[PDB]
Amino acid sequence: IDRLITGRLQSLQTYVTQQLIRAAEIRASANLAATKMSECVLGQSKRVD
Amino acid sequence: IDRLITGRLQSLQTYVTQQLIRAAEIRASANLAATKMSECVLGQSKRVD
Amino acid sequence: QCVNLTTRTQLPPAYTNSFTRGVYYPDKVFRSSVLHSTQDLFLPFFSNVTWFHVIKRFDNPVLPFNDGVYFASIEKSNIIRGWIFGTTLDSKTQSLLIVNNATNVVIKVCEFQFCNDPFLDMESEFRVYSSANNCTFEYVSQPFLNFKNLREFVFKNIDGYFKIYSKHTPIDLPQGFSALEPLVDLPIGINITRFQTLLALHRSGWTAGAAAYYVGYLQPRTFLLKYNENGTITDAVDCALDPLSETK
Amino acid sequence: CTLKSFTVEKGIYQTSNFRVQPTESIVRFPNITNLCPFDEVFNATRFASVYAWNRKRISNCVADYSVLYNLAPFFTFKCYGVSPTKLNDLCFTNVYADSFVIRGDEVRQIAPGQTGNIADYNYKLPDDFTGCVIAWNSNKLDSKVSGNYNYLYRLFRKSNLKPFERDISTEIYQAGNKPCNGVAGFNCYFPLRSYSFRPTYGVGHQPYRVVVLSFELLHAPATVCGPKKSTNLVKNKCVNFNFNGLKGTGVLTESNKKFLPFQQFGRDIADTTDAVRDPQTLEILDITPCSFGGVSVITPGTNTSNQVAVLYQGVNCTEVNVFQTRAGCLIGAEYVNNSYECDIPIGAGICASYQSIIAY
Amino acid sequence: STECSNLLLQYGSFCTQLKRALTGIAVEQDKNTQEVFAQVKQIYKTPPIKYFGGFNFSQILPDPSKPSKRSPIEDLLFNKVTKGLTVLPPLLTDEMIAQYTSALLAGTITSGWTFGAGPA
Ligand SMILES: *[C@@H]1O[C@H](CO)[C@@H](O[C@@H]2O[C@H](CO)[C@@H](O)[C@H](O)[C@H]2NC(C)=O)[C@H](O)[C@H]1NC(C)=O
Ligand SMILES: *[C@@H]1O[C@H](CO)[C@@H](O[C@@H]2O[C@H](CO)[C@@H](O)[C@H](O)[C@H]2NC(C)=O)[C@H](O)[C@H]1NC(C)=O
Ligand SMILES: *[C@@H]1O[C@H](CO)[C@@H](O)[C@H](O)[C@H]1NC(C)=O
Ligand SMILES: *[C@@H]1O[C@H](CO)[C@@H](O)[C@H](O)[C@H]1NC(C)=O
Ligand SMILES: *[C@@H]1O[C@H](CO)[C@@H](O)[C@H](O)[C@H]1NC(C)=O
Ligand SMILES: *[C@@H]1O[C@H](CO)[C@@H](O)[C@H](O)[C@H]1NC(C)=O
Ligand SMILES: *[C@@H]1O[C@H](CO)[C@@H](O)[C@H](O)[C@H]1NC(C)=O
Ligand SMILES: *[C@@H]1O[C@H](CO)[C@@H](O)[C@H](O)[C@H]1NC(C)=O
Ligand SMILES: *[C@@H]1O[C@H](CO)[C@@H](O)[C@H](O)[C@H]1NC(C)=O
């Protein structure tokens, strides 16, 4: 049971770490989307592209 | 052999985790570089600094 | 009683392509709408399968069992009746006998004194073994059985368990997909390294009816099995055959 | 306790998990058919002599030892090397039933390490003997007023028997220096003597029918099992199930799946057992897992109030001021049709606030 | 298994760490949706006579015929996207996010950029 617990706990920690990295990426994308919503939809932007 | 496999697998997962974190940092830097290429090279920017 | 057959015609055994045959259900587990990867004893796709004919041709050699055996039978009139498994095929060791006579299917595990040329011969003449001294297991089961019938069997001997997988198809080998359903789980617990099939003669000397059988050997490999909504295997992928299937 | 503080701020806090405990235990296995032939061994009309003791091998059937234990005429049940209680659980590869007839005084010689005429010359048991002996009186069956001379024992032999050895030879015993030459004269005796049973002998000389069960386990996949008792089948509740040695806990419901005849249990997308076929009645049952929920507590500040609401995440309200939300079942809040700004987020458009605790 | 849980208790607050991290991610997703879509505190509505100088916004304005109150483009977008583990629902439903997009569209069509910097 100690072997099964350590293996499953390591798997769960790996999953949570992957979720944190993906959450950081999605947070960055959401921050970009909020910036686009403010600057492209709520105003006219002179920023190229 | 199990002791060796779990140690090496922990090392490899650690390496992949730092690679993903560095990938996120480099992706942020590349996104900034693409923004600079669009706004500084392909147009004139009124953003200070 | 044993009879030597001296009227054979010398010919080398043929070889042909396995195509996508020899697939069986790996376990007793129902699966629906999923793809499942198994590392089992399987027959490779498009492999070189040995071809024997019965036509004056009477092909009854004794072949090594290896790790598993795929037997294909393009049969009409039910000439092929059974198989013999063992190590030395005598009273020194213990052997497994599978027969289907005119009435019932008999499975025996005994120390048979086998004939060099065992065969079956209304059917009223049985010349398979001369003696059976120590019988440890008996099992009586249901009848298993232009060329009209394709009979596919897979024999495995893993962990002392002898697995018989079977499929019947109304019909060289045809090109198509047919999953072999598990038929008999047999508790023998004996060593098997060599096998020989049993044929039936027709007497009017003797004449051989038109039949063909194929012998293939199993190797450890991974297959990707496709299960439909009804739990029937419809397609499979051999992961080690070609790069496209490896990608799949 | 979860936040390690005596003051809790306003918000929703996930505190524990909700599990539906098992209500009953269900044990299932196949129908008890294809019984072994212990009736042909024990309830036979005629037994063999002890020198030519009958050996019956028992294979590929179900062996019910509970019949032998529960019969009161079978007086002697001396079992060595294995307990009689755990015979129904322990599985063996082959069962050897050695059957013979002896007298009353020689019942004790059917044991490991014993000696006598029966142990040396008729039936020898090994010291590492795994199996039980069964003996019962048969004065009504095996005795006649004239006397029954159909039972023989070997009185003389040149050497003792090996364990589980049968000696059926009628060679004239060599007790003297001169050769016997097959004639039972001086110092030459016929080695087999007759037990002359009569119905008027004492308990030490009445005929006793003895059946010795020897259990062996080999490298073959063991097939002589005990009868496997089946508990009656309970559906629609979260119960423990034991289907053919597959253990688990789940709600059993009727299934629409069309299992193939060989197929017994079914696996889902994630390879967990989601369907099973009952071994006795060939019907398919889905095994939904017992309800699992995240127990979250919605509370305002302890400075303001001590009222709390409980959210059971992903749990229907019928299986736990009760309101059903997509997030789960909310107990302790009253839904208000009025719409306000979100104060405590619940989910799926539902937010909670304190004004009592309301959900909107 | 109760014995497994008893053995698991010896390892400390790993379970609390994992739950706390997942809870942080879960609240972060709702915060992300709130930041992107809830940028207006007034729900603007388009006039009933949807004539805007020859400009057609039918493909982006909400469809009254549809129960979800979504635009044809939004409906197309939703059509084209398809054990101890639980999935928590998002705080903002698809209908409310669609309502926020509708409010932003109504503000940007009827008021230009004025609504983003003050009154519409
Ligand atoms: C049929 O032919 C086989 C092959 O020669 C015979 O088998 C041999 O018989 C001789 C008889 O003296 C034995 O010494 C050999 O050991 C046998 N060979 C093997 C491999 O077992 C067989 O006896 C023939 N059948 C009959 C009825 O004579
Ligand atoms: C605005 O655009 C829509 C869609 O492009 C126009 O609706 C179409 O109208 C014609 C004739 O009236 C129909 O044949 C099409 O099937 C309509 N398409 C759809 C998707 O509804 C609409 O006419 C345009 N003008 C106005 C004033 O709304
Ligand atoms: C099958 O094996 C035979 C000899 O065993 C060989 O001659 C033949 O070429 C093989 N078949 C193929 C397709 O290579
Ligand atoms: C088939 O074999 C079984 C087993 O030996 C036997 O009992 C039966 O009589 C056989 N059938 C015929 C028709 O001889
Ligand atoms: C096998 O048979 C031979 C002769 O029939 C006999 O001597 C021997 O004891 C037997 N062995 C077993 C294990 O039954
Ligand atoms: C089976 O027999 C073969 C040869 O007869 C031998 O090489 C092999 O080791 C045996 N296997 C077992 C499991 O006894
Ligand atoms: C699956 O079974 C249903 C009825 O049980 C049948 O209508 C359907 O055609 C089957 N599907 C396949 C692929 O055979
Ligand atoms: C099992 O036995 C019961 C009688 O107790 C019977 O109703 C049922 O049909 C049997 N099932 C099978 C598969 O034989
Ligand atoms: C023998 O007969 C008795 C008398 O009814 C019965 O109880 C028992 O089950 C039978 N079989 C055996 C093996 O004792």
PDB file of N, CA and C in Angstrom, chain C residues 159-210:
ATOM      1  N   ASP C 159       0.322 -20.213 -18.375  1.00  0.00           N
ATOM      2  CA  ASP C 159       0.152 -20.425 -16.926  1.00  0.00           C
ATOM      3  C   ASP C 159      -0.591 -21.720 -16.607  1.00  0.00           C
ATOM      4  N   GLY C 160      -0.435 -22.732 -17.454  1.00  0.00           N
ATOM      5  CA  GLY C 160      -1.117 -23.991 -17.256  1.00  0.00           C
ATOM      6  C   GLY C 160      -2.554 -23.975 -17.720  1.00  0.00           C
ATOM      7  N   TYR C 161      -2.977 -22.898 -18.375  1.00  0.00           N
ATOM      8  CA  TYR C 161      -4.323 -22.738 -18.899  1.00  0.00           C
ATOM      9  C   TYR C 161      -4.247 -22.840 -20.413  1.00  0.00           C
ATOM     10  N   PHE C 162      -5.049 -23.728 -20.993  1.00  0.00           N
ATOM     11  CA  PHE C 162      -5.026 -23.963 -22.428  1.00  0.00           C
ATOM     12  C   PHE C 162      -6.279 -23.290 -22.974  1.00  0.00           C
ATOM     13  N   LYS C 163      -6.092 -22.211 -23.717  1.00  0.00           N
ATOM     14  CA  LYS C 163      -7.203 -21.432 -24.236  1.00  0.00           C
ATOM     15  C   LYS C 163      -7.457 -21.792 -25.691  1.00  0.00           C
ATOM     16  N   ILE C 164      -8.711 -22.112 -25.998  1.00  0.00           N
ATOM     17  CA  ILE C 164      -9.171 -22.397 -27.350  1.00  0.00           C
ATOM     18  C   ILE C 164     -10.136 -21.293 -27.753  1.00  0.00           C
ATOM     19  N   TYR C 165      -9.785 -20.565 -28.808  1.00  0.00           N
ATOM     20  CA  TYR C 165     -10.615 -19.518 -29.385  1.00  0.00           C
ATOM     21  C   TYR C 165     -11.102 -20.006 -30.741  1.00  0.00           C
ATOM     22  N   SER C 166     -12.376 -19.776 -31.054  1.00  0.00           N
ATOM     23  CA  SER C 166     -12.935 -20.318 -32.285  1.00  0.00           C
ATOM     24  C   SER C 166     -13.817 -19.301 -32.992  1.00  0.00           C
ATOM     25  N   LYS C 167     -13.893 -19.445 -34.313  1.00  0.00           N
ATOM     26  CA  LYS C 167     -14.788 -18.652 -35.144  1.00  0.00           C
ATOM     27  C   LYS C 167     -15.165 -19.472 -36.371  1.00  0.00           C
ATOM     28  N   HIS C 168     -16.436 -19.404 -36.763  1.00  0.00           N
ATOM     29  CA  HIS C 168     -16.928 -20.059 -37.967  1.00  0.00           C
ATOM     30  C   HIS C 168     -17.414 -19.009 -38.955  1.00  0.00           C
ATOM     31  N   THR C 169     -17.000 -19.140 -40.215  1.00  0.00           N
ATOM     32  CA  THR C 169     -17.361 -18.185 -41.251  1.00  0.00           C
ATOM     33  C   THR C 169     -17.904 -18.932 -42.465  1.00  0.00           C
ATOM     34  N   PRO C 170     -19.069 -18.550 -42.988  1.00  0.00           N
ATOM     35  CA  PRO C 170     -19.548 -19.143 -44.246  1.00  0.00           C
ATOM     36  C   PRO C 170     -18.781 -18.577 -45.434  1.00  0.00           C
ATOM     37  N   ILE C 171     -18.104 -19.453 -46.172  1.00  0.00           N
ATOM     38  CA  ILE C 171     -17.308 -19.024 -47.321  1.00  0.00           C
ATOM     39  C   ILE C 171     -17.707 -19.834 -48.549  1.00  0.00           C
ATOM     40  N   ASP C 172      -7.283 -19.830 -51.568  1.00  0.00           N
ATOM     41  CA  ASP C 172      -6.504 -19.266 -50.473  1.00  0.00           C
ATOM     42  C   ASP C 172      -7.432 -18.734 -49.386  1.00  0.00           C
ATOM     43  N   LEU C 173      -6.850 -18.113 -48.362  1.00  0.00           N
ATOM     44  CA  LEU C 173      -7.648 -17.541 -47.288  1.00  0.00           C
ATOM     45  C   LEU C 173      -8.378 -16.295 -47.784  1.00  0.00           C
ATOM     46  N   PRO C 174      -9.610 -16.067 -47.335  1.00  0.00           N
ATOM     47  CA  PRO C 174     -10.310 -14.837 -47.718  1.00  0.00           C
ATOM     48  C   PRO C 174      -9.704 -13.631 -47.025  1.00  0.00           C
ATOM     49  N   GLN C 175      -9.874 -12.470 -47.647  1.00  0.00           N
ATOM     50  CA  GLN C 175      -9.375 -11.221 -47.091  1.00  0.00           C
ATOM     51  C   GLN C 175     -10.528 -10.508 -46.399  1.00  0.00           C
ATOM     52  N   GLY C 176     -10.396 -10.320 -45.093  1.00  0.00           N
ATOM     53  CA  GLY C 176     -11.449  -9.712 -44.309  1.00  0.00           C
ATOM     54  C   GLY C 176     -11.086  -9.751 -42.840  1.00  0.00           C
ATOM     55  N   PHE C 177     -12.041  -9.342 -42.013  1.00  0.00           N
ATOM     56  CA  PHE C 177     -11.848  -9.298 -40.572  1.00  0.00           C
ATOM     57  C   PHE C 177     -12.898 -10.159 -39.891  1.00  0.00           C
ATOM     58  N   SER C 178     -12.448 -11.039 -39.002  1.00  0.00           N
ATOM     59  CA  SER C 178     -13.358 -11.848 -38.200  1.00  0.00           C
ATOM     60  C   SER C 178     -12.698 -12.118 -36.859  1.00  0.00           C
ATOM     61  N   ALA C 179     -13.286 -11.595 -35.788  1.00  0.00           N
ATOM     62  CA  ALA C 179     -12.723 -11.777 -34.461  1.00  0.00           C
ATOM     63  C   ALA C 179     -13.056 -13.170 -33.952  1.00  0.00           C
ATOM     64  N   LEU C 180     -12.096 -13.801 -33.286  1.00  0.00           N
ATOM     65  CA  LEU C 180     -12.296 -15.145 -32.765  1.00  0.00           C
ATOM     66  C   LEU C 180     -12.827 -15.050 -31.342  1.00  0.00           C
ATOM     67  N   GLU C 181     -13.997 -15.618 -31.114  1.00  0.00           N
ATOM     68  CA  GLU C 181     -14.596 -15.627 -29.789  1.00  0.00           C
ATOM     69  C   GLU C 181     -13.926 -16.694 -28.928  1.00  0.00           C
ATOM     70  N   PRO C 182     -13.671 -16.411 -27.650  1.00  0.00           N
ATOM     71  CA  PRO C 182     -13.145 -17.454 -26.758  1.00  0.00           C
ATOM     72  C   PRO C 182     -14.160 -18.564 -26.556  1.00  0.00           C
ATOM     73  N   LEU C 183     -13.696 -19.799 -26.708  1.00  0.00           N
ATOM     74  CA  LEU C 183     -14.566 -20.961 -26.659  1.00  0.00           C
ATOM     75  C   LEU C 183     -14.346 -21.823 -25.428  1.00  0.00           C
ATOM     76  N   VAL C 184     -13.115 -22.267 -25.184  1.00  0.00           N
ATOM     77  CA  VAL C 184     -12.838 -23.198 -24.095  1.00  0.00           C
ATOM     78  C   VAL C 184     -11.656 -22.694 -23.281  1.00  0.00           C
ATOM     79  N   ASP C 185     -11.835 -22.610 -21.969  1.00  0.00           N
ATOM     80  CA  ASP C 185     -10.748 -22.330 -21.044  1.00  0.00           C
ATOM     81  C   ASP C 185     -10.488 -23.678 -20.391  1.00  0.00           C
ATOM     82  N   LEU C 186      -9.303 -24.243 -20.605  1.00  0.00           N
ATOM     83  CA  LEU C 186      -9.055 -25.612 -20.191  1.00  0.00           C
ATOM     84  C   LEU C 186      -7.995 -25.663 -19.099  1.00  0.00           C
ATOM     85  N   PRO C 187      -8.297 -26.227 -17.928  1.00  0.00           N
ATOM     86  CA  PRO C 187      -7.266 -26.395 -16.893  1.00  0.00           C
ATOM     87  C   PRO C 187      -6.438 -27.671 -17.001  1.00  0.00           C
ATOM     88  N   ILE C 188      -5.354 -27.669 -17.772  1.00  0.00           N
ATOM     89  CA  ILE C 188      -4.545 -28.872 -17.929  1.00  0.00           C
ATOM     90  C   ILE C 188      -3.303 -28.844 -17.044  1.00  0.00           C
ATOM     91  N   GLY C 189      -2.592 -27.720 -17.011  1.00  0.00           N
ATOM     92  CA  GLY C 189      -1.356 -27.595 -16.250  1.00  0.00           C
ATOM     93  C   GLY C 189      -0.243 -28.526 -16.688  1.00  0.00           C
ATOM     94  N   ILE C 190      -0.083 -28.738 -17.998  1.00  0.00           N
ATOM     95  CA  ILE C 190       0.974 -29.597 -18.517  1.00  0.00           C
ATOM     96  C   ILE C 190       1.783 -28.851 -19.569  1.00  0.00           C
ATOM     97  N   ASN C 191       2.982 -29.368 -19.826  1.00  0.00           N
ATOM     98  CA  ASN C 191       3.873 -28.797 -20.827  1.00  0.00           C
ATOM     99  C   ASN C 191       3.452 -29.262 -22.217  1.00  0.00           C
ATOM    100  N   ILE C 192       3.332 -28.315 -23.148  1.00  0.00           N
ATOM    101  CA  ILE C 192       3.039 -28.619 -24.545  1.00  0.00           C
ATOM    102  C   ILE C 192       4.096 -27.950 -25.415  1.00  0.00           C
ATOM    103  N   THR C 193       4.778 -28.740 -26.249  1.00  0.00           N
ATOM    104  CA  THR C 193       5.756 -28.194 -27.183  1.00  0.00           C
ATOM    105  C   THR C 193       5.550 -28.636 -28.623  1.00  0.00           C
ATOM    106  N   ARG C 194       4.716 -29.639 -28.883  1.00  0.00           N
ATOM    107  CA  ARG C 194       4.552 -30.159 -30.229  1.00  0.00           C
ATOM    108  C   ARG C 194       3.104 -30.613 -30.405  1.00  0.00           C
ATOM    109  N   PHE C 195       2.584 -30.477 -31.627  1.00  0.00           N
ATOM    110  CA  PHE C 195       1.191 -30.813 -31.901  1.00  0.00           C
ATOM    111  C   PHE C 195       1.083 -31.506 -33.252  1.00  0.00           C
ATOM    112  N   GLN C 196      -0.042 -32.189 -33.455  1.00  0.00           N
ATOM    113  CA  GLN C 196      -0.332 -32.844 -34.727  1.00  0.00           C
ATOM    114  C   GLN C 196      -1.842 -32.900 -34.921  1.00  0.00           C
ATOM    115  N   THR C 197      -2.322 -32.562 -36.116  1.00  0.00           N
ATOM    116  CA  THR C 197      -3.757 -32.611 -36.367  1.00  0.00           C
ATOM    117  C   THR C 197      -4.207 -34.002 -36.812  1.00  0.00           C
ATOM    118  N   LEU C 198      -5.497 -34.273 -36.620  1.00  0.00           N
ATOM    119  CA  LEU C 198      -6.107 -35.554 -36.950  1.00  0.00           C
ATOM    120  C   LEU C 198      -7.077 -35.388 -38.109  1.00  0.00           C
ATOM    121  N   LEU C 199      -6.945 -36.245 -39.114  1.00  0.00           N
ATOM    122  CA  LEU C 199      -7.794 -36.212 -40.293  1.00  0.00           C
ATOM    123  C   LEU C 199      -8.711 -37.431 -40.312  1.00  0.00           C
ATOM    124  N   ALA C 200      -9.687 -37.410 -41.220  1.00  0.00           N
ATOM    125  CA  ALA C 200     -10.580 -38.544 -41.425  1.00  0.00           C
ATOM    126  C   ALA C 200     -10.432 -39.065 -42.847  1.00  0.00           C
ATOM    127  N   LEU C 201     -10.230 -40.370 -42.985  1.00  0.00           N
ATOM    128  CA  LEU C 201     -10.189 -40.979 -44.304  1.00  0.00           C
ATOM    129  C   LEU C 201     -11.592 -41.321 -44.804  1.00  0.00           C
ATOM    130  N   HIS C 202     -11.703 -41.464 -46.123  1.00  0.00           N
ATOM    131  CA  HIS C 202     -12.908 -41.955 -46.777  1.00  0.00           C
ATOM    132  C   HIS C 202     -12.558 -43.278 -47.439  1.00  0.00           C
ATOM    133  N   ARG C 203     -13.335 -44.316 -47.150  1.00  0.00           N
ATOM    134  CA  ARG C 203     -13.072 -45.652 -47.668  1.00  0.00           C
ATOM    135  C   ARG C 203     -14.157 -46.045 -48.660  1.00  0.00           C
ATOM    136  N   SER C 204     -13.738 -46.569 -49.810  1.00  0.00           N
ATOM    137  CA  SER C 204     -14.664 -47.060 -50.822  1.00  0.00           C
ATOM    138  C   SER C 204     -14.364 -48.510 -51.182  1.00  0.00           C
ATOM    139  N   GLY C 205      -8.403 -48.904 -51.330  1.00  0.00           N
ATOM    140  CA  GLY C 205      -7.834 -48.347 -50.118  1.00  0.00           C
ATOM    141  C   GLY C 205      -8.657 -47.215 -49.532  1.00  0.00           C
ATOM    142  N   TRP C 206      -8.064 -46.025 -49.482  1.00  0.00           N
ATOM    143  CA  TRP C 206      -8.726 -44.841 -48.955  1.00  0.00           C
ATOM    144  C   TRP C 206      -8.569 -43.678 -49.924  1.00  0.00           C
ATOM    145  N   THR C 207      -9.491 -42.723 -49.820  1.00  0.00           N
ATOM    146  CA  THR C 207      -9.482 -41.513 -50.628  1.00  0.00           C
ATOM    147  C   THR C 207      -9.599 -40.319 -49.693  1.00  0.00           C
ATOM    148  N   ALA C 208      -8.866 -39.252 -49.994  1.00  0.00           N
ATOM    149  CA  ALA C 208      -8.889 -38.039 -49.188  1.00  0.00           C
ATOM    150  C   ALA C 208      -9.839 -37.008 -49.785  1.00  0.00           C
ATOM    151  N   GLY C 209     -10.764 -36.516 -48.962  1.00  0.00           N
ATOM    152  CA  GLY C 209     -11.657 -35.462 -49.394  1.00  0.00           C
ATOM    153  C   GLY C 209     -10.938 -34.130 -49.503  1.00  0.00           C
ATOM    154  N   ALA C 210     -11.537 -33.204 -50.247  1.00  0.00           N
ATOM    155  CA  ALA C 210     -10.901 -31.913 -50.496  1.00  0.00           C
ATOM    156  C   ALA C 210     -10.967 -31.033 -49.252  1.00  0.00           C
TER     157      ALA C 210
END
